[PDB]
Amino acid sequence: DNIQGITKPAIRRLARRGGVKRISGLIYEETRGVLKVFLENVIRDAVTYTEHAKRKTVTAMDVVYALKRQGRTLYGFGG
Amino acid sequence: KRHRKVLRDNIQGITKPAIRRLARRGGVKRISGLIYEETRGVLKVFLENVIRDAVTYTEHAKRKTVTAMDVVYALKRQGRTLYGFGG
Amino acid sequence: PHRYRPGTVALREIRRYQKSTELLIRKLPFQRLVREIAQDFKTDLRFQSSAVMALQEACEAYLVGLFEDTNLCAIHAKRVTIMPKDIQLARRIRGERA
Amino acid sequence: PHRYRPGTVALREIRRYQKSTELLIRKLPFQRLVREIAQDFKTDLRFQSSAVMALQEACEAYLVGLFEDTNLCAIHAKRVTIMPKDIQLARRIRGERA
Amino acid sequence: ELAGNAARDNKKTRIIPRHLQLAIRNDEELNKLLGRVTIAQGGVLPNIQAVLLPK
Amino acid sequence: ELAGNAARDNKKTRIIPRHLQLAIRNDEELNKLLGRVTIAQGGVLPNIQAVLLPK
DNA sequence: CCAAAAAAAAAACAGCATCCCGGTGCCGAGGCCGCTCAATTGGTCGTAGACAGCTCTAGCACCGCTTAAACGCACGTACGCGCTGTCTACCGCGTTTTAACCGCCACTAGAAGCGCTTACTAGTCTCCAGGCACGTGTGAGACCGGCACATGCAAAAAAAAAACGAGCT
DNA sequence: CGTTTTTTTTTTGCATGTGCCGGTCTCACACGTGCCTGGAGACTAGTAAGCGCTTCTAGTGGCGGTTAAAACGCGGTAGACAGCGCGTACGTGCGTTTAAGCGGTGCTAGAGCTGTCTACGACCAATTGAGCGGCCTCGGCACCGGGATGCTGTTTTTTTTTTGGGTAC
């Protein structure tokens, strides 16, 4: 329901930093299903750290470990 | 000291029919010419990168013989882990 | 009666947006899409605004990276228009999907 | 005389070798090639016979995986013939290639 | 269990490297567990691309 | 050093997350080192392909 | 209707190679044995982490205003895409060449196992400033704003390599 | 041969971005305090590993022969690749629409630190059988030859679509 909030003009801007000139309209659809799959994977694991600390607030340090888990290390928040 | 053997250039030992059989297993139906010396480029960089690491393991262990197990701590380190040679 | 040619502004937007470092997804519509999915693993959850920020950074950065490869897969097909089959391919090779 | 069409024996070879698991580099040239390279870091190194088999399993697989990735990039440029431009691509996405 | 199933499919009493590969690389889950891992003398699964078949 | 440079190049007397990101991907080695790393507020290098530019 | 014709197809025959069979052979699976060491039992002692309590940080809610951004539609351009003609690279098959691989040989580098000696680091307890949380100041950088100038873009004319005749042999 | 062309250079006018001169403002870098805990120090204690000696695994190298794989050339199929034309899916842009962002305040869930207590794991000693190294047998699986059968490619069998002269309507 909130999936869209990632607007067609938002995707456009990512791809333009991604070095893209011309974009099929079929892609805006595609990008959402990809982005969703990425946040699922990362979130899921990130909460798994929260639920093992037994907190109910998810922390920067919970995401950092879950990204570092997924191969995606994030310099900037704790570390 | 030193003894018989100094190096050679076995790079051309990768018979065309050898690289062709790899690609036939890799689902390839047709193969350009420029292919076979392209592959000789990559395969060479692979081993250099594995054997560098494996040699780095032997030197820690102060041997002169590279084990099966030296190759494996490197191959894994280079995210290409192998099952069938211990570890 | 002035008009630009289909592409010459996209290239201006490219030039511009690489040069800059600000988050190109709006911060609320994301922060909801963080909460929405998160409730599927456990309900009644909070989030440090930093840990929202953490996810936007990594998700924008991820897709930036994926668009580059998908761009490369579409050039490789004698194209400049990227397509879904150019994402599908760049993940297949990335080893994200089968 | 008898004569199959170009491609026909290529199919049978695929099926024949995809089926089996035995090494398709000649173990001698390989060994000399492994030795030859081993020297560049330090000369006069002995190798377990498992160690040269360990590498020859690692290398032959990696490449069969590369030719899978490579054959798609080619079909993905609408072609059947794999090419340099395909192995370059595959490696680039893979990040083995800057 | 699957390694054995493949062996018995193969008509073999003995599980062999091939069989481990066959099993792991058909089950989605095991495959994805063993993504960054090589299975000595396993080869690959019979996967010809369907654009490379006969006309 | 590399980022303290790219501050000078943008007449900046303070390093920011961009200046490191540029420093690090304009040294082939460090780049390779931090190959799987994601820097916050980094952005990419200016880079458009040949086939996208004008004739 | 009864032609094409060419294309497109169907199957009929003929041929080649792979699959699955029993007939054969050996070596590696599988097990049994006997022994060493690593898992268990029992007891002791020290502290990791659980629990209850409290502090207070920061995450959630809402609100109203000021745009920055999203949406939406319109018009046409440039690019996706098919189809087609061409041209030679590659696959197929065969004759010619090569040395991999086989089973064994003898040689001995050095891998690995032992025992001793000792110099090195855990472990304690005492002491204290390095480096933390806290709190204050002020100049970098945000942010304009406009002129000016250099970059690149979209046009609208002007020289320069096709199509178009007539028109001799 | 000197006519229509595209269409390839040439001003041509035009719009953004990049400043480099201004100028004002704000909050985050920067630095200062005060105290507390984490590194410094000196002494003790125990064993990890460095050293010298031995065992004997296993890694090397060379032979000689068999014949499987490497090589090379010829020929033509078929696939790469360019060219060209037809269609609309995208981009550009200005107009309308939304709701994000900002700065603010109100509320308290829960993050997080503190002092207490005791359950559980390390630690330490003795036992004792689990699981190892070694040894030995026989049946699974490699090997081979022979035959059935699926499967490819080349002819022939026929059967359509681009086209083609008669026929009434």
From Swiss-Prot, chain B:
Mutagenesis / variant outcome for changing R20W: In TEBIVANED3; results in early developmental defects when expressed in zebrafish embryos
Cross-link (Glycyl lysine isopeptide (Lys-Gly) (interchain with G-Cter in SUMO2)): K5, K16, K44, K64, K76
Cross-link (Glycyl lysine isopeptide (Lys-Gly) (interchain with G-Cter in UFM1)): K16
Residues recorded as bearing N6-crotonyllysine in the entry: K1
Protein name: Histone H4
Residues recorded as bearing N6,N6,N6-trimethyllysine in the entry: K5
Modified residues (N6-lactoyllysine): K1, K16, K62, K76
DNA-binding region(s), residue ranges: 1-5
Sequence positions bearing N6-butyryllysine: K1, K16, K29, K62, K64, K76
Outcome after substituting P17R: In TEBIVANED3; results in early developmental defects when expressed in zebrafish embryos
Record-listed N6-propionyllysine modification sites: K1, K16, K29, K62, K64, K76
Gene: H4C1
Shown residues in whole-protein numbering: 17 to 103 of 103
Residues modified as N6-(beta-hydroxybutyryl)lysine: K16, K62, K76
Curated annotation (Swiss-Prot), chains C, D:
GO biological process: chromatin organization; epigenetic regulation of gene expression; gene expression; nucleosome assembly; telomere organization
A GO-annotated cellular component: nucleosome
Modified residues (Phosphoserine): S20, S49
Modified sites of kind N6-glutaryllysine: K19, K42, K78, K85
UniProt main location, coarse: nucleus
Domain of life of the source: Eukaryota
Post-translational modification N6-(beta-hydroxybutyryl)lysine, affected residues: K19, K42, K85
Modified residues (N6,N6-dimethyllysine): K42
Keywords in alphabetical order: Acetylation, ADP-ribosylation, Chromosome, Citrullination, Disease variant, DNA-binding, Hydroxylation, Lipoprotein, Methylation, Nucleosome core, Nucleus, Phosphoprotein, Ubl conjugation
Positions where N6-lactoyllysine occurs in the chain: K19, K42
Positions carrying N6-methyllysine: K19, K27, K42, K85
Protein modification: Acetylation is generally linked to gene activation. Acetylation at Lys-85 (H3K122ac) by EP300/p300 plays a central role in chromatin structure: localizes at the surface of the histone octamer and stimulates transcription, possibly by promoting nucleosome instability.
Phosphotyrosine PTM sites in chain numbering: Y4
Subcellular location field: Nucleus; Chromosome
Modified residues (N6,N6,N6-trimethyllysine): K19, K42
Residues recorded with modification Phosphothreonine: T43, T70
Keyword Zinc-finger: no
Record-listed N6-(2-hydroxyisobutyryl)lysine modification sites: K19, K27, K42, K85
Sites bearing N6-acetyllysine, chain numbering: K19, K42, K78, K85
Location of N6-succinyllysine modifications: K19, K42, K85
GO molecular function, one term: cadherin binding
Function of the protein: Core component of nucleosome. Nucleosomes wrap and compact DNA into chromatin, limiting DNA accessibility to the cellular machineries which require DNA as a template. Histones thereby play a central role in transcription regulation, DNA repair, DNA replication and chromosomal stability. DNA accessibility is regulated via a complex set of post-translational modifications of histones, also called histone code, and nucleosome remodeling.
Subunit organization: The nucleosome is a histone octamer containing two molecules each of H2A, H2B, H3 and H4 assembled in one H3-H4 heterotetramer and two H2A-H2B heterodimers. The octamer wraps approximately 147 bp of DNA. Interacts with TONSL; CHAF1A; CHAF1B; MCM2 and DNAJC9. Interacts with NASP; NASP is a histone chaperone that stabilizes and maintains a soluble pool of Histone H3-H4 dimers.
Family label: Belongs to the histone H3 family.
Name the UniProt record assigns to this protein: Histone H3.1
Species annotation: Homo sapiens (Human)
Curated annotation (Swiss-Prot), chains E, F:
UniProt superkingdom: Eukaryota
Residues found modified as N6-crotonyllysine: K55
N6-(2-hydroxyisobutyryl)lysine PTM sites in chain numbering: K11, K12, K32, K55
UniProt PTM: It is involved in the initiation of both imprinted and random X inactivation. Ubiquitinated H2A is enriched in inactive X chromosome chromatin. Ubiquitination of H2A functions downstream of methylation of 'Lys-27' of histone H3 (H3K27me). H2AK119Ub by RNF2/RING2 can also be induced by ultraviolet and may be involved in DNA repair.
Modification type N6-(beta-hydroxybutyryl)lysine: residues: K32, K55
Compartments it resides in: Nucleus; Chromosome
Positions bearing N6-succinyllysine: K32
Sites bearing N6-glutaryllysine, chain numbering: K32, K55
Residues with N5-methylglutamine modification: Q41
Family: Belongs to the histone H2A family.
Subunit text: The nucleosome is a histone octamer containing two molecules each of H2A, H2B, H3 and H4 assembled in one H3-H4 heterotetramer and two H2A-H2B heterodimers. The octamer wraps approximately 147 bp of DNA.
Reported function: Core component of nucleosome. Nucleosomes wrap and compact DNA into chromatin, limiting DNA accessibility to the cellular machineries which require DNA as a template. Histones thereby play a central role in transcription regulation, DNA repair, DNA replication and chromosomal stability. DNA accessibility is regulated via a complex set of post-translational modifications of histones, also called histone code, and nucleosome remodeling.
Name of protein: Histone H2A type 1-B/E
Native source species: Homo sapiens (Human)
This protein's encoding gene: H2AC4
